[PDB]
Amino acid sequence: TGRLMLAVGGAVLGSLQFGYNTGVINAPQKVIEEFYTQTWVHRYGESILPTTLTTLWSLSVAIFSVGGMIGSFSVGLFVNRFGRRNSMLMMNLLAFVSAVLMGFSKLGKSFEMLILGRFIIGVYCGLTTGFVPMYVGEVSPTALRGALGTLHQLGIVVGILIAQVFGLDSIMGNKDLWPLLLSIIFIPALLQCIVLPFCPESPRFLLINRNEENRAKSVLKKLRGTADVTHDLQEMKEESRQMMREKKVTILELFRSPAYRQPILIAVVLQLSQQLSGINAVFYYSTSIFEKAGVQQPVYATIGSGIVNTAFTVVSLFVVQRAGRRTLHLIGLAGMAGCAILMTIALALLEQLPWMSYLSIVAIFGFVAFFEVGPGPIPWFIVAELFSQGPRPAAIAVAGFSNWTSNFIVGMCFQYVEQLCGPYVFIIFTVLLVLFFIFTYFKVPET
Ligand SMILES: CCCCCCCCCO[C@@H]1O[C@H](CO)[C@@H](O)[C@H](O)[C@H]1O
């Protein structure tokens, strides 16, 4: 466990990037929108329509996920064909070409470049949800493999908290320095783009995929200071027993077969339950939502949501090993439904009672807290237990496809639905939260 941390850490750097680019565009929205609306006027000799600006900026945050879906679709392709590290490494090209397209959308005078770079860094982020946990989950000793996949999660949530903090009016969330905010990705990226060639090609890859018995044999002795493991080698050839003794069923079979048509119904819904709960609304729009409430200095309440989120991600790890699977998923769903009620109250009585600005903050803090213990981790956990070593991969691509899809819908349409619907938006998310809650009570089993 010496040279190992180098490889693990450099990998997670890309889960950080996932953490950033996701929770970035939520603190400096009206700053770019001012860029949007001014750009429009100069160009088209006409001023921007409010709804235009809305769907336009909606697409800038949304088109991220169109990207990530494709990214997560293409994950299997690069991994097997190129190894894990040679993929992490080469995909930094995506990180750089998007960093440039956004951070020079400044004198570019083009919000296309901004949306495009958002797409591309969506692809990069889609691909990276697959590369990272994989790599970390072959490199690590099987014992420490549990406590170390922890870093892909943590990487994201911390990655988020940074996007928010860097987002401050006083850092890079301001009329002058928001392209360096959207671009500073490169400083993480180039770092990994340097660390990585010092990092080892996956042993389960050199042995099973690349069929190098001796070249793979050599990686571990470095990767493990004083282990030199016959146990790891027999495991890799027993992992290539069970993962290769049950046929890798394709996604396309999952659907055609009635045997699977039900387990797959559950896994998928669980993903809708995660995104259609309405979180990325509080993580794409935290600041705009806190404003409209009555919050003064809304980005701090955003970073409030940042800290609380990271806090309960760590608390979840403990509670997750302890309790049932749909225990946490229910309690999690519950609080979130009730918090989205507190919200719609605050957002409602705000006008008669000022300090509901505060109730907004309370609502959402416990609402993201309640999230990370429940619908956060549980719908992933359940798929790995709803499918054996054979249909399990096919199962994950569909899961991840629901996740990137219900994500696009919240991101693209949450602004649609805050205008036409007012301080009741969280009653939409409360009606879902209930439905979902109900669904899991009668249809999803313990695991
Ligand atoms: C055993 C595997 C466990 C998987 C752990 C998942 C941890 C929860 C992370 O979920 C993510 O939370 C973000 C905010 O925290 C959202 O922006 C994002 O859309 C959502 O997907």
Tab-separated table of C-alpha atoms and ligand atoms in Angstrom:
chain	number	residue	atom	x	y	z
A	1	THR	CA	0.000	0.000	0.000
A	2	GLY	CA	2.842	2.378	-0.887
A	3	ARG	CA	3.156	3.065	-4.607
A	4	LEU	CA	-0.581	2.280	-4.750
A	5	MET	CA	-1.801	5.679	-3.479
A	6	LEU	CA	-0.083	7.349	-6.445
A	7	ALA	CA	-2.185	5.405	-8.942
A	8	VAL	CA	-5.468	5.688	-6.997
A	9	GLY	CA	-5.115	9.402	-6.297
A	10	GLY	CA	-4.251	10.355	-9.856
A	11	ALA	CA	-7.301	8.424	-11.051
A	12	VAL	CA	-9.761	10.068	-8.648
A	13	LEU	CA	-8.581	13.438	-9.988
A	14	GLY	CA	-11.037	12.660	-12.761
A	15	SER	CA	-13.835	12.080	-10.237
A	16	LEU	CA	-12.965	15.547	-8.913
A	17	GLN	CA	-13.460	16.857	-12.442
A	18	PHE	CA	-16.778	15.062	-12.378
A	19	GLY	CA	-17.455	16.815	-9.076
A	20	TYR	CA	-16.569	20.251	-10.448
A	21	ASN	CA	-18.202	20.535	-13.963
A	22	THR	CA	-21.418	19.197	-12.492
A	23	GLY	CA	-21.880	21.646	-9.597
A	24	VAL	CA	-20.250	24.642	-11.278
A	25	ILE	CA	-22.897	26.395	-13.330
A	26	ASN	CA	-25.154	26.933	-10.280
A	27	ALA	CA	-23.357	29.822	-8.521
A	28	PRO	CA	-22.528	32.087	-11.421
A	29	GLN	CA	-25.637	31.733	-13.596
A	30	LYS	CA	-26.832	35.343	-13.930
A	31	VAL	CA	-23.282	36.452	-14.655
A	32	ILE	CA	-23.100	34.324	-17.789
A	33	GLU	CA	-26.691	35.083	-18.596
A	34	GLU	CA	-25.639	38.727	-18.684
A	35	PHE	CA	-23.047	37.494	-21.145
A	36	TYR	CA	-25.792	35.635	-22.957
A	37	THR	CA	-28.147	38.584	-23.162
A	38	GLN	CA	-25.482	41.058	-24.169
A	39	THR	CA	-24.077	38.703	-26.781
A	40	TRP	CA	-27.548	38.356	-28.247
A	41	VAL	CA	-28.074	42.104	-28.570
A	42	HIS	CA	-24.772	42.843	-30.226
A	43	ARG	CA	-25.193	39.997	-32.696
A	44	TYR	CA	-28.833	40.081	-33.723
A	45	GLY	CA	-29.535	43.806	-33.279
A	46	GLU	CA	-32.385	42.762	-30.984
A	47	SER	CA	-32.626	41.955	-27.258
A	48	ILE	CA	-33.066	38.525	-25.705
A	49	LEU	CA	-36.492	37.219	-24.705
A	50	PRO	CA	-36.709	35.990	-21.070
A	51	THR	CA	-37.868	32.460	-21.971
A	52	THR	CA	-35.288	32.264	-24.769
A	53	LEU	CA	-32.510	33.069	-22.293
A	54	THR	CA	-34.106	30.469	-20.088
A	55	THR	CA	-34.155	27.497	-22.525
A	56	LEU	CA	-30.845	28.735	-23.920
A	57	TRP	CA	-29.121	28.782	-20.538
A	58	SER	CA	-31.149	25.644	-19.702
A	59	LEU	CA	-29.466	23.846	-22.614
A	60	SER	CA	-26.034	25.047	-21.431
A	61	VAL	CA	-26.475	23.199	-18.183
A	62	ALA	CA	-28.592	20.392	-19.721
A	63	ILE	CA	-26.582	19.457	-22.841
A	64	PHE	CA	-24.009	18.358	-20.304
A	65	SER	CA	-26.028	15.120	-19.812
A	66	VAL	CA	-26.756	14.368	-23.457
A	67	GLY	CA	-22.962	14.305	-23.411
A	68	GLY	CA	-22.578	12.117	-20.303
A	69	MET	CA	-24.965	9.472	-21.529
A	70	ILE	CA	-22.898	8.950	-24.674
A	71	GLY	CA	-19.828	9.139	-22.467
A	72	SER	CA	-21.150	6.326	-20.273
A	73	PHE	CA	-22.242	4.436	-23.350
A	74	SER	CA	-18.790	4.549	-24.794
A	75	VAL	CA	-17.089	3.533	-21.547
A	76	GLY	CA	-16.998	-0.197	-22.300
A	77	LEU	CA	-15.401	0.480	-25.696
A	78	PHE	CA	-12.288	2.324	-24.589
A	79	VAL	CA	-11.611	0.355	-21.372
A	80	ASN	CA	-11.333	-3.105	-22.910
A	81	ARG	CA	-9.593	-1.997	-26.077
A	82	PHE	CA	-7.071	0.416	-24.450
A	83	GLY	CA	-6.783	-0.454	-20.777
A	84	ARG	CA	-8.091	1.802	-18.066
A	85	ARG	CA	-5.150	4.146	-17.526
A	86	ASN	CA	-4.365	4.604	-21.230
A	87	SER	CA	-7.992	5.792	-21.463
A	88	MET	CA	-8.062	8.121	-18.454
A	89	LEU	CA	-4.895	9.589	-19.913
A	90	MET	CA	-5.994	10.009	-23.511
A	91	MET	CA	-9.438	11.319	-22.562
A	92	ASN	CA	-7.828	14.347	-21.034
A	93	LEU	CA	-7.979	15.507	-24.630
A	94	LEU	CA	-11.700	15.927	-24.045
A	95	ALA	CA	-11.049	17.886	-20.856
A	96	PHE	CA	-8.708	20.230	-22.679
A	97	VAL	CA	-10.823	20.832	-25.798
A	98	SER	CA	-13.820	21.752	-23.644
A	99	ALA	CA	-11.777	23.908	-21.234
A	100	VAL	CA	-10.649	25.920	-24.225
A	101	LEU	CA	-14.120	26.133	-25.824
A	102	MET	CA	-15.689	27.518	-22.622
A	103	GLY	CA	-12.834	29.718	-21.337
A	104	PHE	CA	-12.432	31.461	-24.675
A	105	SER	CA	-16.161	31.839	-25.214
A	106	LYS	CA	-15.182	35.216	-23.787
A	107	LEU	CA	-13.597	36.951	-26.801
A	108	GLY	CA	-15.223	34.214	-28.799
A	109	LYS	CA	-18.504	36.135	-28.413
A	110	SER	CA	-20.075	32.691	-28.786
A	111	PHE	CA	-22.339	30.866	-26.369
A	112	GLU	CA	-22.275	28.006	-28.827
A	113	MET	CA	-18.676	27.365	-27.725
A	114	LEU	CA	-20.011	27.383	-24.186
A	115	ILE	CA	-22.744	24.831	-24.878
A	116	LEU	CA	-20.432	22.748	-27.044
A	117	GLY	CA	-17.710	22.646	-24.431
A	118	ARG	CA	-20.443	21.738	-22.008
A	119	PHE	CA	-21.403	18.863	-24.234
A	120	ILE	CA	-17.854	17.589	-24.692
A	121	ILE	CA	-16.961	17.894	-20.998
A	122	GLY	CA	-20.220	16.017	-20.540
A	123	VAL	CA	-18.870	13.205	-22.718
A	124	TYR	CA	-15.618	13.245	-20.752
A	125	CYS	CA	-17.538	13.094	-17.522
A	126	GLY	CA	-19.745	10.298	-18.880
A	127	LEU	CA	-16.723	8.185	-19.768
A	128	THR	CA	-15.043	8.854	-16.439
A	129	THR	CA	-17.836	7.372	-14.266
A	130	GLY	CA	-16.812	4.041	-15.814
A	131	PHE	CA	-13.020	4.341	-16.082
A	132	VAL	CA	-12.357	5.399	-12.502
A	133	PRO	CA	-14.198	2.909	-10.219
A	134	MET	CA	-12.945	0.123	-12.486
A	135	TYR	CA	-9.260	1.036	-12.321
A	136	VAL	CA	-9.413	1.602	-8.553
A	137	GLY	CA	-11.294	-1.695	-8.256
A	138	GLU	CA	-8.650	-3.820	-9.966
A	139	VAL	CA	-5.560	-2.047	-8.606
A	140	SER	CA	-6.633	-2.238	-4.965
A	141	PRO	CA	-6.199	-5.283	-2.715
A	142	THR	CA	-9.624	-6.937	-2.458
A	143	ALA	CA	-9.854	-6.112	1.261
A	144	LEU	CA	-9.251	-2.378	0.845
A	145	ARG	CA	-11.398	-2.384	-2.302
A	146	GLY	CA	-14.485	-1.424	-0.358
A	147	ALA	CA	-13.044	1.501	1.568
A	148	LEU	CA	-11.308	2.755	-1.598
A	149	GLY	CA	-14.190	2.892	-4.069
A	150	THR	CA	-15.248	5.438	-1.476
A	151	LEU	CA	-12.978	7.892	-3.217
A	152	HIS	CA	-14.973	8.035	-6.510
A	153	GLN	CA	-17.978	9.215	-4.556
A	154	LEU	CA	-16.118	11.554	-2.224
A	155	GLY	CA	-14.240	12.791	-5.255
A	156	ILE	CA	-17.443	13.998	-6.804
A	157	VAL	CA	-19.022	15.606	-3.768
A	158	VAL	CA	-15.798	17.410	-2.841
A	159	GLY	CA	-15.459	18.252	-6.501
A	160	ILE	CA	-18.859	19.887	-6.122
A	161	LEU	CA	-18.029	21.845	-3.000
A	162	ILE	CA	-15.072	23.359	-4.846
A	163	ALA	CA	-17.162	24.437	-7.848
A	164	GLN	CA	-19.422	26.279	-5.432
A	165	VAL	CA	-16.629	27.904	-3.377
A	166	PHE	CA	-14.659	28.883	-6.509
A	167	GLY	CA	-18.032	30.183	-7.614
A	168	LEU	CA	-18.017	33.096	-5.154
A	169	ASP	CA	-18.594	36.629	-6.517
A	170	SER	CA	-15.204	37.335	-4.936
A	171	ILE	CA	-13.293	34.463	-6.575
A	172	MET	CA	-14.280	33.662	-10.154
A	173	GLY	CA	-18.063	34.125	-10.078
A	174	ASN	CA	-18.061	37.625	-11.550
A	175	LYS	CA	-18.415	39.501	-14.895
A	176	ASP	CA	-14.659	39.384	-15.536
A	177	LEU	CA	-13.368	36.013	-14.268
A	178	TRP	CA	-16.029	33.421	-15.123
A	179	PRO	CA	-14.193	32.072	-18.103
A	180	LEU	CA	-11.193	31.157	-15.912
A	181	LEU	CA	-13.771	29.596	-13.581
A	182	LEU	CA	-15.180	27.423	-16.356
A	183	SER	CA	-11.640	26.700	-17.604
A	184	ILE	CA	-9.519	26.041	-14.467
A	185	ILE	CA	-10.358	22.366	-15.201
A	186	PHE	CA	-7.003	22.199	-17.044
A	187	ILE	CA	-5.051	22.601	-13.778
A	188	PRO	CA	-6.583	19.346	-12.495
A	189	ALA	CA	-6.397	17.772	-15.968
A	190	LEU	CA	-2.791	18.507	-16.848
A	191	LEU	CA	-1.890	17.303	-13.387
A	192	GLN	CA	-3.402	13.910	-14.086
A	193	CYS	CA	-2.038	14.228	-17.605
A	194	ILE	CA	1.378	14.030	-15.942
A	195	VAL	CA	0.811	11.752	-12.969
A	196	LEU	CA	-0.725	9.048	-15.178
A	197	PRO	CA	2.226	7.922	-17.283
A	198	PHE	CA	3.887	7.159	-13.931
A	199	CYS	CA	0.923	4.915	-13.090
A	200	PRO	CA	0.503	1.164	-13.782
A	201	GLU	CA	-1.659	-0.430	-16.498
A	202	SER	CA	-4.342	-2.526	-14.780
A	203	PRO	CA	-3.276	-6.066	-13.727
A	204	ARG	CA	-6.719	-7.585	-14.470
A	205	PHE	CA	-6.234	-5.995	-17.877
A	206	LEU	CA	-2.717	-7.191	-18.678
A	207	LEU	CA	-3.683	-10.686	-17.507
A	208	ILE	CA	-7.255	-11.258	-18.718
A	209	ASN	CA	-7.705	-8.651	-21.509
A	210	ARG	CA	-4.111	-8.250	-22.800
A	211	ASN	CA	-3.213	-11.865	-21.908
A	212	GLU	CA	0.218	-10.898	-20.663
A	213	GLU	CA	0.849	-13.390	-17.864
A	214	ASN	CA	4.322	-12.053	-17.131
A	215	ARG	CA	3.795	-8.302	-17.727
A	216	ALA	CA	0.817	-8.332	-15.331
A	217	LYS	CA	2.762	-10.467	-12.864
A	218	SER	CA	5.287	-7.628	-12.694
A	219	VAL	CA	2.905	-4.727	-11.880
A	220	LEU	CA	1.780	-5.998	-8.472
A	221	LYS	CA	5.258	-6.376	-6.936
A	222	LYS	CA	5.473	-2.606	-7.380
A	223	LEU	CA	1.795	-2.022	-6.657
A	224	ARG	CA	2.264	-4.087	-3.511
A	225	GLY	CA	5.439	-3.334	-1.578
A	226	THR	CA	5.679	-6.483	0.519
A	227	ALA	CA	2.803	-8.685	-0.622
A	228	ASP	CA	3.775	-10.515	-3.839
A	229	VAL	CA	0.363	-12.121	-4.038
A	230	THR	CA	-0.522	-15.640	-5.189
A	231	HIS	CA	-3.878	-14.822	-3.619
A	232	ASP	CA	-4.437	-11.838	-5.971
A	233	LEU	CA	-3.466	-13.957	-8.984
A	234	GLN	CA	-5.797	-16.828	-8.098
A	235	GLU	CA	-8.542	-14.216	-7.483
A	236	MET	CA	-7.975	-12.636	-10.882
A	237	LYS	CA	-8.325	-16.075	-12.445
A	238	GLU	CA	-11.370	-16.850	-10.276
A	239	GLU	CA	-12.804	-13.399	-11.034
A	240	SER	CA	-12.213	-14.503	-14.613
A	241	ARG	CA	-13.978	-17.680	-13.599
A	242	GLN	CA	-17.333	-16.330	-12.380
A	243	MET	CA	-17.351	-13.127	-14.513
A	244	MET	CA	-16.545	-15.368	-17.495
A	245	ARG	CA	-18.490	-18.528	-16.519
A	246	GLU	CA	-21.829	-16.772	-16.676
A	247	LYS	CA	-22.357	-15.353	-20.171
A	248	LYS	CA	-22.075	-11.567	-20.436
A	249	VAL	CA	-25.644	-10.936	-21.512
A	250	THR	CA	-26.173	-7.800	-23.537
A	251	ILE	CA	-28.564	-4.964	-22.796
A	252	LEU	CA	-30.568	-6.080	-25.791
A	253	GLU	CA	-31.318	-9.437	-24.141
A	254	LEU	CA	-32.273	-7.986	-20.748
A	255	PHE	CA	-35.225	-6.308	-22.509
A	256	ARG	CA	-36.307	-9.244	-24.706
A	257	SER	CA	-36.354	-11.669	-21.781
A	258	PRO	CA	-39.259	-11.883	-19.342
A	259	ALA	CA	-36.836	-13.404	-16.799
A	260	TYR	CA	-35.150	-10.025	-16.530
A	261	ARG	CA	-37.968	-7.750	-17.539
A	262	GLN	CA	-38.920	-7.387	-13.899
A	263	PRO	CA	-35.509	-7.024	-12.099
A	264	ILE	CA	-34.693	-4.492	-14.740
A	265	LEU	CA	-37.967	-2.683	-14.111
A	266	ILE	CA	-36.833	-2.176	-10.554
A	267	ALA	CA	-33.199	-1.117	-11.148
A	268	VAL	CA	-34.277	1.418	-13.759
A	269	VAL	CA	-37.054	3.002	-11.712
A	270	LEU	CA	-34.596	3.410	-8.860
A	271	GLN	CA	-32.557	5.632	-11.196
A	272	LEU	CA	-35.583	7.785	-12.005
A	273	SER	CA	-36.059	7.940	-8.239
A	274	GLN	CA	-32.584	9.446	-7.923
A	275	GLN	CA	-32.752	12.159	-10.621
A	276	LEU	CA	-36.549	12.846	-10.707
A	277	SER	CA	-36.372	13.445	-6.967
A	278	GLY	CA	-35.141	16.871	-7.994
A	279	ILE	CA	-31.607	17.123	-6.556
A	280	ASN	CA	-29.736	18.599	-9.461
A	281	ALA	CA	-32.346	21.306	-9.220
A	282	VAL	CA	-30.704	22.146	-5.849
A	283	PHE	CA	-27.314	21.559	-7.477
A	284	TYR	CA	-27.806	23.412	-10.733
A	285	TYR	CA	-29.901	26.198	-9.277
A	286	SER	CA	-29.113	26.395	-5.547
A	287	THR	CA	-28.214	30.068	-5.822
A	288	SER	CA	-31.169	31.103	-8.042
A	289	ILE	CA	-33.567	29.180	-5.777
A	290	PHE	CA	-32.179	30.720	-2.598
A	291	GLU	CA	-32.456	34.225	-4.079
A	292	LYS	CA	-36.060	33.781	-5.167
A	293	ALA	CA	-36.703	32.521	-1.643
A	294	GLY	CA	-35.469	35.385	0.452
A	295	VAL	CA	-31.939	34.367	1.016
A	296	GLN	CA	-29.397	37.172	1.088
A	297	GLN	CA	-26.005	36.063	-0.216
A	298	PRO	CA	-27.390	32.864	-1.843
A	299	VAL	CA	-24.079	31.347	-2.955
A	300	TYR	CA	-23.116	30.859	0.689
A	301	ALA	CA	-26.309	28.939	1.160
A	302	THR	CA	-25.152	27.121	-1.939
A	303	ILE	CA	-21.824	26.348	-0.316
A	304	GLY	CA	-23.939	25.526	2.710
A	305	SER	CA	-25.586	22.869	0.539
A	306	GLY	CA	-22.031	22.029	-0.495
A	307	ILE	CA	-20.736	21.314	2.975
A	308	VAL	CA	-23.891	19.518	4.123
A	309	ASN	CA	-23.792	17.309	1.051
A	310	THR	CA	-20.174	16.276	1.559
A	311	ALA	CA	-20.973	15.856	5.251
A	312	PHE	CA	-23.780	13.349	4.750
A	313	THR	CA	-21.923	11.525	1.972
A	314	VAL	CA	-19.386	10.620	4.656
A	315	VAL	CA	-22.162	9.910	7.198
A	316	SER	CA	-23.873	7.676	4.608
A	317	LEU	CA	-20.839	5.346	4.290
A	318	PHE	CA	-21.241	4.446	7.912
A	319	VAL	CA	-24.999	4.166	7.973
A	320	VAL	CA	-24.982	2.254	4.650
A	321	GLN	CA	-22.973	-0.681	5.949
A	322	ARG	CA	-25.280	-0.715	8.995
A	323	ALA	CA	-28.882	-0.713	7.777
A	324	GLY	CA	-30.950	-2.410	5.084
A	325	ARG	CA	-30.887	-1.435	1.426
A	326	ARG	CA	-34.440	-0.201	1.006
A	327	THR	CA	-34.394	0.950	4.649
A	328	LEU	CA	-32.090	3.804	3.812
A	329	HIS	CA	-33.817	4.264	0.474
A	330	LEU	CA	-37.148	4.775	2.206
A	331	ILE	CA	-36.068	7.002	5.093
A	332	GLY	CA	-34.015	8.884	2.510
A	333	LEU	CA	-36.964	9.318	0.153
A	334	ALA	CA	-39.224	10.266	3.094
A	335	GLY	CA	-37.206	13.166	4.520
A	336	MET	CA	-36.671	14.468	1.002
A	337	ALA	CA	-40.402	14.506	0.341
A	338	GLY	CA	-41.050	16.303	3.631
A	339	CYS	CA	-38.155	18.707	3.059
A	340	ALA	CA	-39.551	19.576	-0.380
A	341	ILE	CA	-42.675	20.407	1.584
A	342	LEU	CA	-40.848	22.701	4.001
A	343	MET	CA	-39.446	24.308	0.891
A	344	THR	CA	-42.781	24.963	-0.818
A	345	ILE	CA	-43.956	26.412	2.537
A	346	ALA	CA	-41.005	28.751	2.925
A	347	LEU	CA	-41.326	29.669	-0.744
A	348	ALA	CA	-45.036	30.230	-0.028
A	349	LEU	CA	-45.154	32.069	3.344
A	350	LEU	CA	-41.995	34.022	2.409
A	351	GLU	CA	-44.093	37.006	1.384
A	352	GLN	CA	-46.075	37.181	4.640
A	353	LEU	CA	-43.242	35.837	6.801
A	354	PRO	CA	-39.805	37.160	5.710
A	355	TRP	CA	-37.579	34.728	7.615
A	356	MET	CA	-38.906	31.838	5.514
A	357	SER	CA	-35.773	32.719	3.615
A	358	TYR	CA	-34.266	30.761	6.403
A	359	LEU	CA	-36.732	27.901	6.153
A	360	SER	CA	-35.620	27.598	2.503
A	361	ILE	CA	-32.072	26.934	3.623
A	362	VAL	CA	-33.182	24.486	6.328
A	363	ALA	CA	-35.433	22.603	3.940
A	364	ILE	CA	-32.792	22.102	1.316
A	365	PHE	CA	-29.929	21.334	3.701
A	366	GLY	CA	-31.701	18.424	5.330
A	367	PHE	CA	-33.071	17.674	1.846
A	368	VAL	CA	-29.624	17.049	0.412
A	369	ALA	CA	-28.581	15.527	3.718
A	370	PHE	CA	-31.545	13.158	3.512
A	371	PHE	CA	-30.602	12.526	-0.079
A	372	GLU	CA	-27.127	11.191	0.416
A	373	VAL	CA	-28.215	8.632	2.982
A	374	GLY	CA	-31.026	7.321	0.775
A	375	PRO	CA	-31.580	7.742	-3.001
A	376	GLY	CA	-27.930	8.716	-3.331
A	377	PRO	CA	-26.117	5.358	-3.033
A	378	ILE	CA	-28.946	2.792	-2.746
A	379	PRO	CA	-30.151	2.575	-6.388
A	380	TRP	CA	-26.603	1.755	-7.530
A	381	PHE	CA	-26.088	-0.884	-4.787
A	382	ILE	CA	-29.342	-2.621	-5.721
A	383	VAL	CA	-28.482	-3.235	-9.388
A	384	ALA	CA	-25.209	-5.014	-8.490
A	385	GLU	CA	-27.348	-7.279	-6.357
A	386	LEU	CA	-30.219	-7.593	-8.848
A	387	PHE	CA	-27.909	-9.061	-11.485
A	388	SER	CA	-25.235	-11.800	-11.345
A	389	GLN	CA	-21.739	-11.542	-12.877
A	390	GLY	CA	-23.332	-12.117	-16.311
A	391	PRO	CA	-26.222	-9.709	-16.936
A	392	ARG	CA	-24.778	-7.265	-14.370
A	393	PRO	CA	-22.847	-5.207	-16.953
A	394	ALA	CA	-25.845	-4.902	-19.334
A	395	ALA	CA	-27.875	-3.935	-16.266
A	396	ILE	CA	-25.525	-1.054	-15.416
A	397	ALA	CA	-25.510	0.519	-18.868
A	398	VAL	CA	-29.329	0.713	-18.719
A	399	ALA	CA	-29.247	2.015	-15.145
A	400	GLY	CA	-26.717	4.679	-16.102
A	401	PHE	CA	-28.836	5.452	-19.153
A	402	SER	CA	-31.860	6.205	-16.972
A	403	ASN	CA	-29.712	8.312	-14.724
A	404	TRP	CA	-28.351	10.464	-17.562
A	405	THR	CA	-31.873	10.671	-18.993
A	406	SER	CA	-33.926	11.743	-15.967
A	407	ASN	CA	-31.007	14.077	-15.354
A	408	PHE	CA	-31.486	15.787	-18.751
A	409	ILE	CA	-35.212	16.239	-17.933
A	410	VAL	CA	-34.678	17.929	-14.554
A	411	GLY	CA	-31.855	20.079	-15.903
A	412	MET	CA	-33.594	21.031	-19.143
A	413	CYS	CA	-37.091	21.498	-17.772
A	414	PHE	CA	-36.736	22.645	-14.176
A	415	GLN	CA	-36.620	26.275	-15.333
A	416	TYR	CA	-39.703	25.649	-17.539
A	417	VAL	CA	-41.514	24.422	-14.529
A	418	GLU	CA	-40.444	27.059	-12.026
A	419	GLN	CA	-41.908	29.780	-14.246
A	420	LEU	CA	-45.243	28.167	-15.184
A	421	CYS	CA	-45.681	26.745	-11.653
A	422	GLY	CA	-44.230	29.138	-9.028
A	423	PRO	CA	-43.313	28.271	-5.388
A	424	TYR	CA	-44.959	24.866	-5.851
A	425	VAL	CA	-42.202	23.242	-7.870
A	426	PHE	CA	-41.214	21.176	-4.858
A	427	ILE	CA	-44.736	19.782	-4.780
A	428	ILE	CA	-44.015	18.312	-8.191
A	429	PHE	CA	-40.929	16.714	-6.640
A	430	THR	CA	-43.013	15.814	-3.594
A	431	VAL	CA	-45.577	13.964	-5.729
A	432	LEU	CA	-42.762	11.983	-7.373
A	433	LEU	CA	-40.998	11.371	-4.078
A	434	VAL	CA	-44.259	9.856	-2.865
A	435	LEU	CA	-44.950	7.738	-5.967
A	436	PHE	CA	-41.381	6.483	-5.911
A	437	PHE	CA	-41.670	5.933	-2.180
A	438	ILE	CA	-44.823	3.883	-2.758
A	439	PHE	CA	-43.243	1.943	-5.632
A	440	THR	CA	-40.277	0.801	-3.593
A	441	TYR	CA	-42.538	-0.283	-0.739
A	442	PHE	CA	-44.361	-2.928	-2.754
A	443	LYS	CA	-42.124	-3.778	-5.708
A	444	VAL	CA	-38.421	-3.543	-4.709
A	445	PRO	CA	-37.167	-6.266	-2.319
A	446	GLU	CA	-34.345	-6.312	0.223
A	447	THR	CA	-30.803	-7.095	-0.945
B	1	LIG	C1	-21.631	1.389	-4.270
B	1	LIG	C2	-21.702	2.543	-5.245
B	1	LIG	C3	-22.173	3.786	-4.512
B	1	LIG	C4	-22.421	4.951	-5.461
B	1	LIG	C5	-22.267	6.229	-4.653
B	1	LIG	C6	-23.056	7.394	-5.227
B	1	LIG	C7	-22.969	8.553	-4.244
B	1	LIG	C8	-24.051	9.586	-4.508
B	1	LIG	C9	-23.678	10.459	-5.694
B	1	LIG	O1	-24.802	10.645	-6.553
B	1	LIG	C10	-24.687	11.904	-7.209
B	1	LIG	O2	-24.857	12.965	-6.266
B	1	LIG	C11	-24.595	14.256	-6.811
B	1	LIG	C12	-24.740	15.271	-5.687
B	1	LIG	O3	-24.137	14.742	-4.504
B	1	LIG	C13	-25.531	14.509	-7.996
B	1	LIG	O4	-25.217	15.748	-8.635
B	1	LIG	C14	-25.399	13.385	-9.020
B	1	LIG	O5	-26.280	13.594	-10.126
B	1	LIG	C15	-25.693	12.059	-8.338
B	1	LIG	O6	-25.575	10.973	-9.260
